[PDB]
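Q: Second attempt. The first request was missing the SMILES, so the protein and chloride ion are both included now.
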Amino acid sequence: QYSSNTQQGRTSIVHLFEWRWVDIALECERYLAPKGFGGVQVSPPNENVAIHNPFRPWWERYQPVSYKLCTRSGNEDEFRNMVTRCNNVGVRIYVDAVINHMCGNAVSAGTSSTCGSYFNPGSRDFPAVPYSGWDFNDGKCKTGSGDIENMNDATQVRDCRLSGLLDLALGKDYVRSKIAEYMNHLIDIGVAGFRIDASKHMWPGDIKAILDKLHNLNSNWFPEGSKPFIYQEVIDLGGEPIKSSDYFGNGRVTEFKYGAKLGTVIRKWNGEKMSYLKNWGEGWGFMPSDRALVFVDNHDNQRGHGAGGASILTFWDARLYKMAVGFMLAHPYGFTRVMSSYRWPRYFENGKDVNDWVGPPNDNGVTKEVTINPDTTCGNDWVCEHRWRQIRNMVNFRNVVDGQPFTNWYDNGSNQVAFGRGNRGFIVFNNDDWTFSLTLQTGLPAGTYCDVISGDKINGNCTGIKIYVSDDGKAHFSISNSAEDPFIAIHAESKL
Ligand SMILES: [Ca+2]
Ligand SMILES: [Cl-]
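A: Got both inputs this time. The predicted holo structure:
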């Protein structure tokens, strides 16, 4: 469950948040494959409640109605078409598995659902599965409300309703079997793994019992005996009874400490600075590198949901965001996930975004296609961070330097730092309020290299900055503190 099942030479996943299946399919062929992306995390592909107050929020997709593959992203044929076309160009699909719960206990009964399936939350009736009152934790939960009230009590965190979400009885073989049925449907279609939603709210042993029922990966695209990549959403910032390590038996775990700390560092908050990043990883109290799923932001915290945090960097803070993403993709710690977002009309009232609910760009509820502008950015309010040159090129940097040791570290004791990845890549950051001008040991073979942050290599030359590495491995770097992108990155494939 620990292996990503990506192609050799591809090393990141991109979250194409709320994208339609037909658009992801095209994106795999036209962009993700030729740019060396490892795979795509998709939004939950199972049928959910259609919530009209507020108007079709992104979070409706975290309220299941059935396991029919029928959502605003598309239907089953569209989903299957996407997985096939992506696998055929060597780009994997990872499904956001919403398996802790069905929908909110106060949602009205009826057919207000993405495939029109009937459901009755009040009577715990989900006939499209089917689930009944017998399949929920109502009798197991010990709280007065029936909801989670106290996260210091690990039992209620697992057995009670997360914010009123009907809590599936995952201790029951029947429930485990219906969930495995859904996950096996997806595996056989050709998915490579799963982001396990709300993993903290499930017993590690119940997750184990479900994973025991899972097939090996589709044997047309994957070597015999391949296991689904599992990464579990567990928010563990310390000081709680439940720990990320409790989930290591099932797969990788999201390291939410990563983005929280990196955001603080890059913002230069809390007395933190880039020179402190020399021992980034377990040295900062993080989980083992071989278990961490890392990211700067995710779909929750980029809008103040989840554990939120003021320090989180997002596309809204584009300059600092590119630096944080660049550092993450250059550094060997963890398995990397790049966020890809949509714009929404952010509006702050008494500290919070009152539009943090807004779903994807839509025409009266119908998700808008991703249009591609002539400059390769996206239209229709899709942000497409993964298409930003500075991020896309760092995704390839990580591929090129895969397996190479963290080496040749430099810092000025403040916010001017640099490091190499063996003899394959070198990166330089200036986050101080003065110019960084210095000759540094790069560890690289002598030659002329395109800076992949300011430009591209296009057979024979560079469209941005050129760096000249002398016979002894040294090169001069000049970065103004006023630079739009105050970092430079070079690697073996950017050499002329
Ligand atoms: Ca639960
Ligand atoms: Cl996540």
